[PDB]
């Protein structure tokens, strides 16, 4: 089913982001953002590549298939031949169309799941000092620079370095 | 998979609700509830209608299929004919039953996903002033009337109108 | 100072059918269906075909005298008839088991 991220609680995509599928947008003391997340997008590329190659290699190529000839006293066999060809053609066209239609919902839900998990990870490693504000943005009670940005990105945040100082600012706003 | 809402953290359904699939139940100063959510249920109706029409239009109708006749020296061709008919019949009955069995889990998980997303939306636009209490209910520290009920329903809540007053009552209970 | 989390967007216009929806605009896609062909008749693996022209298979094996051009041919990949191949049997009659001979001939 729909996991709720793409065109969900997160609004439309980012045109300005180029080198990936899933990324961040940061505004510390000296810049704006648009950096991609090269870890998760590589797993997505691997999954999709394996999927397409599997769908290609399940379908065998056909060899030579040439029509046959019958005279006017072999109408019965000729109708049988036509029945066999039309039956197999209907079966294969059904299989092809149905396979593509199911595979498309599978892949769109796969991307949706990736975005939701990439959001939950960032939320989980910023437990207290964040104050999420809407459509997947956070806001750092403490002060952050480029190093803590990369520290968030990699997945190594070390929360107890900042845990006291944030607390002060939180009690300032409350 | 199972998204966890229907017969999950939310208990059984509402018999008293009529005009939709997903709705609300409110108890402000002057009434009880059971109003439907006409936005999401319309998307569900559109999806299911397109699904059923797609499943109908993938199956081609058959034209005239009449049995054939053979004498006592054409047993070989007769067995071939019977083999062709039984083979195609087995293939089509397999495809029909398997298509229905997979489509049923797909549609039940689709409804389950819709209920979970409709819960997450209401939670997200009532960040501080709610105090959720169990099986998908909220409880408004501030005071609400019919206008803020519709304000929740449409998706236009304007939280900073109430954000201070709620805070007072919250500190009363703590 | 913030982090926001989002996803890629583009200016692509290619559409994909799905079960719950029709004409979905996707960012990247791949085709799985061939349409294009030349108008030519080339040779399988570097061996030329054999074009009967205005001649039939019966006319070629019997040696119908108007099929005098293709008298020295002895190797091919496949046999091409046209819609004007009529020179088959000049003296009238009936080639017996003509179709079985055409089926034996498709393995030589």
């Amino acid at each position: 089913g729909l996991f709720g991220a793409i065109a969900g609680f997160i609004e439309g995509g980012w045109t300005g982001m180029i080198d990936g599928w899933y990324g961040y947008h940061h505004q510390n003391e000296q810049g704006s953002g648009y950096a991609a997340d090269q870890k998760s997008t590589q797993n997505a590329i691997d999954g999709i590549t394996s999927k397409v190659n599997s769908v290609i290699e399940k379908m065998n190529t056909q060899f030579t298939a040439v029509g046959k000839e019958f005279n006017n006293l072999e109408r019965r066999i000729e109708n049988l031949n036509k029945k066999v060809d039309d039956g197999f053609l209907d079966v294969w066209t059904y299989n092809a169309e149905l396979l593509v239609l199911l595979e498309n919902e599978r892949t769109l839900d796969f991307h949706d799941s990736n975005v939701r998990n990439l959001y939950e990870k960032v939320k989980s490693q910023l437990r207290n000092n964040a104050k999420e504000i809407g459509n997947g943005c956070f806001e750092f009670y403490h002060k952050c620079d480029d190093e803590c940005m990369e520290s968030v990105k990699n997945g190594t945040y070390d929360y107890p370095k900042y845990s006291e100082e944030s607390k002060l600012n939180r009690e300032e706003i409350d | 998979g199972l998204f966890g809402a229907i017969a999950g953290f939310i208990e059984g359904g509402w018999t008293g609700m009529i005009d939709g699939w997903y709705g609300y139940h409110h108890q402000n100063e002057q009434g009880s509830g059971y109003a439907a959510d006409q936005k999401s249920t319309q998307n569900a109706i559109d999806g299911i209608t397109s699904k059923v029409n797609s499943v109908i239009e993938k199956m081609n109708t058959q034209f005239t299929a009449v049995g054939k006749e053979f004498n006592n020296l054409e047993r070989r061709i007769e067995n071939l004919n019977k083999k062709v008919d039984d083979g195609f019949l087995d293939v089509w009955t397999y495809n029909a039953e398997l298509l229905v069995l997979l489509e049923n889990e797909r549609t039940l998980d689709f409804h389950d996903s819709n209920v979970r997303n409709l819960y997450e939306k209401v939670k997200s636009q009532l960040r501080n002033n709610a105090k959720e209490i169990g099986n998908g209910c909220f409880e408004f520290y501030h005071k609400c009337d019919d206008e803020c009920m519709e304000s929740v329903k449409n998706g236009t809540y304007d939280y900073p109108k109430y954000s201070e007053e709620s805070k007072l009552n919250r500190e009363e209970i703590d | 100072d913030t982090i926001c989390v989002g996803y890629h967007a583009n200016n692509s216009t290619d559409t994909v059918d799905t079960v719950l929806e029709k004409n979905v605009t996707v960012t990247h896609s791949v085709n799985l269906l061939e349409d294009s062909h030349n108008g030519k008749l080339c040779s399988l693996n570097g061996i030329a075909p054999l074009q009967l022209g205005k001649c039939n298979v019966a006319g070629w094996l019997l040696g119908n005298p108007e099929c005098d051009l293709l008298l020295t041919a002895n190797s091919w990949s496949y046999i091409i008839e046209t819609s004007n191949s009529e020179n088959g049997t000049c003296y009238p009659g009936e080639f017996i088991d003509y179709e079985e001979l055409r089926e034996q001939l498709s393995s030589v």
Partner: antibody
Amino acid sequence: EVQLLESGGGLVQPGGSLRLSCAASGFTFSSYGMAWVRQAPGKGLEWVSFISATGLSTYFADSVKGRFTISRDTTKNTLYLQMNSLRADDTAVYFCARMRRTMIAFGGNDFWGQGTLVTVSS
Amino acid sequence: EVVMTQSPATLSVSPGEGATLSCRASQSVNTNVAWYQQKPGQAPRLLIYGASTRATGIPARFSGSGSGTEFTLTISTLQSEDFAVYYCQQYSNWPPITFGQGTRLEIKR
């Protein structure tokens, strides 16, 4: 209707201090970022400072680091900018302006004040 | 710091004509450019944001165009009140928000 009134100008000795104030009326004040933009006499615009909607993010221009602070009060709906230890080249007309959106790409400043004058000389 | 530059410095024009104005960035902002006009002794006002979308309550003779590093403001007709000063602003990579340098607009006789 949205208007931004502002005050706190006047001639001040070099090395002094001010506290300009911009009072907003016509919108929900606690859901938009605000910015201060000055203009030297007979020159172009120049950005000075910015405070976010929640008040958790403050940014200043590079030339005015450490000498300026900014704060907001929700109850009075009032934006304050505190200036300390001025110079001769801070003589400008100061404007309080409103961010059009609440994202990072805010999309221009739709509403503006009317300008208070500040002269620093001896 | 993205540095903006306007061109030309001063455009003289006769009434009943159009005009074109160029703003050029040192780096590639995507579409995050806005324009403003300023009368003498007035507050600025928002004309055109996102380089395409005109602001609410703007007459339709104003037009904005461009992407990448070069942007263009175009005025179709004049009625002698549009002679003002024009500024361009990027908001792609702030802080610090950077404005242009202004191009005044004169009557030609």
